[PDB]
Design a protein around this ligand. Structure first.
Ligand code: FE
Length: 54
């Protein structure tokens, strides 16, 4: 699946890993994350992530 980078801190949201410490099971697409999910490192909102692909 895809990877998305936080443009603030460099955290990479990996859809294969999810974010299970914050309620997100592995295999959850970025578009499926709750509207109030934020970067687990810096707190940036979803708007500040970019998909890693051309
Ligand atoms: Fe961040």
């Amino acid at each position: 699946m895809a990877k998305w980078v936080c443009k603030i801190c460099g955290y990479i949201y990996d859809e294969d890993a999810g974010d299970p410490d914050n309620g997100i099971s592995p295999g959850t697409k970025f578009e499926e994350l709750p509207d109030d999910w934020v970067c687990p490192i810096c707190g940036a909102p979803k708007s500040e992530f970019e998909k890693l692909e051309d």
